[PDB]
Write a protein that binds this DNA or RNA. Structure first.
Ligand SMILES: O=C(O)CCC(=O)C(=O)O
Ligand SMILES: [Mn+2]
Length: 267
DNA sequence: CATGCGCTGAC
DNA sequence: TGTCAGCGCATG
């Protein structure tokens, strides 16, 4: 009727250590209803009474060369972009169907889908096979086309470019991601200080200090969250997520406006 | 740079 | 016969 924290953490760390081939020191774990650590600089897990992981933070899982390489390219592409966000894969937003994102054909989407996602997906696989099996079991039940389009288990990738003193960015405003049917997987890039650009869970009073190469697995639909400002550097991050629509709404294999016309005549 | 089409939880 | 801001995406 109640899981003991000591044993569960021993198991999660054991599986993580063998899969990621690195030891996570000073790891901690807390039930979702309990008091959460105010500051997380090390491996961290939260869960419900049943023991399913609703949050997992693994520091520095990505290899240095990989993080550095993707950072230089991201910043290069983003310089030639206006908006501070981008999306690859599919989106159902504001439509009763899943559509291919506009960025996919652009330089950013091409980079994410063809180069980045295939490599990151392996680390997403490492991650889910450790902390949450139900998530990966669910993701593979989706349409074959999504996996092909985004070259990932997640149908959708969000690209967030946060420069200093930008308070207008959607990640700077406390929110839940309410269309999420599963916990998202987050990866960080760029360069910023470890006292800044942290992810704060507002209602849990918990600050996760995230750094390039770190991974964060958590439910955005349940736990309200916000990202702190940076005074220097450049904070770039990738969010792999799945909207409810991906399972429910139909898919016309085209962009938003085109998929809409097709939707009408489909009747 | 404001408006139209369109969805949806949070209130 | 509830309102509305907001991981889209244009058009002028
Ligand atoms: O950047 C982060 O750490 C969180 C971003 C996020 O929650 C989002 O993109 O909706
Ligand atoms: Mn979010």
């Amino acid at each position: 009727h109640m899981i003991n924290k000591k044993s569960l953490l021993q198991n999660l760390l054991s599986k993580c250590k063998t899969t990621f081939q690195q030891s996570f020191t000073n790891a901690n774990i807390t039930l979702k209803d309990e008091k959460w650590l105010k500051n997380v600089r090390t491996a961290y897990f939260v869960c419900d009474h049943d023991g399913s992981v609703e949050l997992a933070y693994l520091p520095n899982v990505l290899p240095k060369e990989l993080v550095e390489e993707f950072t230089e390219k991201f910043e290069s592409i983003q310089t030639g972009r206006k908006k501070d966000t981008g999306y690859s894969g599919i989106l159902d937003n504001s439509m009763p169907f899943n559509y291919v994102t506009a960025d996919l054909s652009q330089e950013l989407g091409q980079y994410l889908s063809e180069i980045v996602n295939p490599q990151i997906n392996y680390y997403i696989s490492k991650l889910l096979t450790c902390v949450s099996s139900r998530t990966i079991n669910y993701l593979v039940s989706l349409n074959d086309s999504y996996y092909a389009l985004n070259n990932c288990l997640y149908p959708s990738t969000a690209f967030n470019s946060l420069k200093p003193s930008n308070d207008g960015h959607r990640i700077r405003k406390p929110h839940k991601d309410n269309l999420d049917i599963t916990p998202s997987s987050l990866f960080y890039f760029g360069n910023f200080q470890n006292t800044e650009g942290y992810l704060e869970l507002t209602d849990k009073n918990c600050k996760v200090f995230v750094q390039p190469g770190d991974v964060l697995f958590f439910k955005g639909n349940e736990y309200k969250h916000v990202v702190a400002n940076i005074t220097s550097g450049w904070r770039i991050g990738l969010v792999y997520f799945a909207h409810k629509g991906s399972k429910t709404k139909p898919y016309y294999e085209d962009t938003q406006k085109n998929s809409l016309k097709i939707h009408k005549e489909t009747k």
